[PDB]
Design a protein around this ligand. Sequence first.
Ligand SMILES: CN1CCC(n2cc(Nc3nc(OC4(C)CC4)c4nc(-c5cnn(C)c5)ccc4n3)cn2)CC1
Ligand SMILES: CN1CCC(n2cc(Nc3nc(OC4(C)CC4)c4nc(-c5cnn(C)c5)ccc4n3)cn2)CC1
Ligand SMILES: CN1CCC(n2cc(Nc3nc(OC4(C)CC4)c4nc(-c5cnn(C)c5)ccc4n3)cn2)CC1
Ligand SMILES: CN1CCC(n2cc(Nc3nc(OC4(C)CC4)c4nc(-c5cnn(C)c5)ccc4n3)cn2)CC1
Length: 288
Amino acid sequence: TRFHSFSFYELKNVTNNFDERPISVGGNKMGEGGFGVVYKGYVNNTTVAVKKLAAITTEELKQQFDQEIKVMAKCQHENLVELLGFSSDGDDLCLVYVYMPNGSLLDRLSCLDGTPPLSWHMRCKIAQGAANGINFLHENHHIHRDIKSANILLDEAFTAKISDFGLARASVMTSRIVGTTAYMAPEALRGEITPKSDIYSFGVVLLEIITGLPAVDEHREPQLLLDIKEEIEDEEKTIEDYIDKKMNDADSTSVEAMYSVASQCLHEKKNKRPDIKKVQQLLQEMTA
Ligand SMILES: CN1CCC(n2cc(Nc3nc(OC4(C)CC4)c4nc(-c5cnn(C)c5)ccc4n3)cn2)CC1
Ligand SMILES: CN1CCC(n2cc(Nc3nc(OC4(C)CC4)c4nc(-c5cnn(C)c5)ccc4n3)cn2)CC1
Ligand SMILES: CN1CCC(n2cc(Nc3nc(OC4(C)CC4)c4nc(-c5cnn(C)c5)ccc4n3)cn2)CC1
Ligand SMILES: CN1CCC(n2cc(Nc3nc(OC4(C)CC4)c4nc(-c5cnn(C)c5)ccc4n3)cn2)CC1
């Protein structure tokens, strides 16, 4: 697959000079990370998302921009975001993607901008879709290294689409430890590079789908959502205590079936964790 080489001013045109005001206000800014700002645009009579990279050295940022392109050139799947083009220019790095009508999983779980809560049926399909996207990357010998709800984007049909490949690796140890701390496997925080870590991170994403809570809340007991696993095992709290109350269609059997998959993904021992193929098989058996 080949990408369109855009000019910074030819991208400044579609985003109305990268209007930093929100969409609701009438601007073009639709969100931010980690590591730049996602902007709304229209080009070839189609809506696009333009991410403007912000500088955590600028030489290391350029490497992630390059990794992104390399992975996006090789990998293409139904449950993966598609790269449209990029702007190289003089210290101005921008990536172009197709606009995701429903934004991110993080934002739909928090009902940001007054969006309706996701039903348990929509949540099961989003989890299945995301596991299919991770399956494609693991089959194509890639490790994402940053599986999180802000990187699981959603289209008009709520089709889960994995994004941000700026840290992905082919198929081990490393001195430069990267990823999101609230989602990292114990061994990943220790410098190991294994697709078994991507499973741990997906286990956190699943607890977010069950609870509607963020992975980390400094003003919460426990601060890390992955710790609720221990509270449940210790009978300190139940799964019912943690189930998102913003659902009317969540049956106790399939919620506990999804919790079982998350609990297994969240094993301390990377080898005692199921592979993405077992994850997909369990998530499929959950909608039966
Ligand atoms: C600082 N940086 C700014 C941006 C700059 N730049 C890149 C392009 N275009 C481009 N670059 C590719 O190489 C990489 C990813 C940059 C290293 C590339 N690679 C593949 C490919 C196919 N299979 N695989 C495994 C990879 C396909 C298409 C590609 N197109 C234009 N400007 C590079 C330097
Ligand atoms: C200042 N800077 C401006 C921009 C300029 N620049 C141009 C490119 N274009 C590019 N580069 C590739 O390089 C590698 C090998 C991926 C890294 C590349 N590779 C493949 C390919 C297909 N199979 N494999 C194994 C690789 C296809 C197309 C490609 N296009 C990248 N940077 C550099 C200097
Ligand atoms: C300031 N600067 C602006 C940009 C301008 N510039 C344009 C290019 N375009 C380019 N460069 C490639 O490769 C090199 C030179 C980076 C390594 C390249 N490679 C492949 C390819 C296909 N298979 N493989 C394995 C590689 C395809 C297309 C490519 N296009 C390079 N510099 C120079 C001056
Ligand atoms: C009420 N409504 C307000 C509007 C709302 N909404 C829709 C979008 N569309 C969107 N947003 C992206 O980014 C986020 C979620 C803002 C941060 C995004 N990102 C990429 C991407 C792929 N890789 N990388 C590195 C980035 C591709 C496509 C995208 N599409 C944003 N908000 C829906 C609900």
